[PDB]
Write a protein that binds this ligand. Structure first.
Ligand SMILES: Cc1ccncc1-c1cc(N)c2cnc(NC(=O)[C@H]3C[C@@H]3C#N)cc2c1
Ligand SMILES: Cc1ccncc1-c1cc(N)c2cnc(NC(=O)[C@H]3C[C@@H]3C#N)cc2c1
Lengths: 289, 280
């Protein structure tokens, strides 16, 4: 439910095309009037299904108006099926791409991080947290431009918090550090910086560190006292400025991890020559490789 | 270990819900064979039991005198029933509502017995998370006991390879450590002294937000007169603002208030006697 939801059938305005992506129901679609391409995320919805999560997710997306975040074109409601209409990105995600091209070049990774940091600075300026930064959620269009997508996990966290906030009851025995986690969450937007650092390793190595480890064992490894941030594996392949970018983004203490704005001044993402031309090259490798 | 794949209604007669949602789905029940009374707590399951048996084994390997007795557990139609000791007198909140305010010596004994229970749970990397009068049980032997529901959300997690360490910490523990129990015990002592925690009449949200301000100062006992230096000091240190400075359960057990002589179950049997008089 949304206060600007179009109360009509999206198929009156769009021609459905193929289904997109694992980890979605997302469809490529074409505006019947304009022939423009879009992406339509359909989710069937009984009237008894709780709307809280879908309500927050639409809200999070409509109040975004930034180039590095997939544009929003309204939502629909018809026939017990909700639809979210957003910008379409012809090349899909960076994960879809590197599974074909192999590891990106350092300059390509540098451009991608700058564009992601720009989007994160905008999200964090709205006090939004993405919380699922990864190769699979960084979309690339035919022009080689970078857009951030998939606010599902961000919506889930916000939905449950507001619910845990009004199902609070008697917190009069609650310690101060617990109440801070109750109201604010236990972590802040700097988690997106860490995730970006992991994504940089992912685009260099085709998987995040510890990808071959059982996920539960990973949660325990990262919570141990002596846990050390991960590092690039093939050190000789990369410059010191890239290593430092990983080191600083992967600062273990969130009280010392630089913000998105600060990172956008780092040497790796402030060097000259970073433009979508680097990704047009990557996309040509994808086509002609 | 014995988890029964049986309907617990085969063995017990349910009698009445206990508490008022403060405990959840908890029932007084009678053993159909003997007449023994027990308390049966129901907890819903998903189709997700391996770890379940591990936590059960720990619950019956326990014979700590400050943990409620565990008799068994039933699994039936995706619902887990935990069979426990039944305390006729209920909680300390059940008691002081009829009795009134506890005495400083009675409060000191409770704090000692609760601290021992807390030291046990913390030694298992369990956090109680809900220390308060309503959750401190008193059996007819005069024993002060805590319930161990540590046995009792991958949605938040999903895949963890990209998440920050602090996000993983929130996903596992929850953003804090067992020292939150020490704060809740300090508040509980005040509850036992005044029949309410500090700020009971303020709106939950308001109270929550006031604590996050850096201008927050811990609460204190209402009437400075009725209480001794030891009690006041016990409060001060248990209600330490920063968890990095809050004393552990083991350390708090050496505090003067819970070490003094004369702490014995007589204090609690006296309380039950007063309760018995109030109900006639
Ligand atoms: C990632 C995600 C997770 C969860 N919900 C939605 C999305 C999501 C959102 C959007 N706005 C998208 C826009 N465009 C694309 N483009 C393609 O998938 C190219 C490969 C197809 C062709 N041809 C995918 C998109 C996926
Ligand atoms: C604390 C807790 C937290 C969450 N879930 C269950 C319990 C719990 C566990 C147990 N083992 C109990 C055993 N006995 C009682 N007794 C009464 O409530 C007497 C006053 C009623 C009458 N008549 C309550 C019990 C509550």
């Amino acid at each position: 439910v949304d206060p600007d939801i179009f109360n009509r059938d999206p198929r009156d305005h769009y021609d459905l095309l193929q289904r997109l992506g694992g980890g979605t129901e997302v469809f490529k679609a074409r505006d019947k009037v304009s022939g423009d391409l879009v992406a339509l995320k359909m989710v069937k919805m009984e009237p008894d299904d709780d709307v809280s999560t879908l309500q927050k997710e639409i809200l999070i997306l409509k109040t975004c108006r930034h180039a590095n975040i997939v544009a929003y074109h309204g939502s629909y409601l018809w026939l017990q099926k909700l639809w979210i209409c957003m910008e379409f990105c012809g090349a899909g995600s960076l994960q879809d791409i590197y599974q074909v091209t192999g590891s990106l070049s350092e300059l390509q990774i540098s451009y991608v991080c700058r564009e992601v940091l720009q989007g994160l600075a905008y999200l964090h300026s709205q006090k939004k947290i993405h919380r699922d930064i990864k190769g699979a959620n960084i979309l690339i269009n035919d022009a080689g431009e970078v857009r951030l997508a998939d606010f599902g996990i961000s919506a889930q966290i916000g939905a449950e918090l507001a619910r845990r906030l009004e199902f609070i009851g008697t917190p009069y025995w609650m310690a101060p550090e617990v109440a801070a986690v109750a109201l604010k969450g236990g972590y802040n937007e700097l988690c997106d910086i860490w995730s970006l650092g992991i994504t940089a390793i992912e685009l260099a190595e085709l998987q995040p560190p510890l990808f071959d480890v059982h996920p539960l064992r990973v949660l325990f490894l990262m919570t141990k006292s002596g846990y050390q941030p991960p590092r690039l594996k093939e050190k000789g392949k990369w410059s010191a400025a890239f290593h430092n970018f990983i080191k600083v983004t992967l600062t273990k203490s969130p009280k010392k991890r630089p913000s998105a704005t600060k990172m956008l001044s780092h040497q790796l993402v402030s060097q000259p020559g970073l433009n979508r031309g680097l990704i047009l090259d990557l996309l040509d490798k994808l086509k002609n490789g």
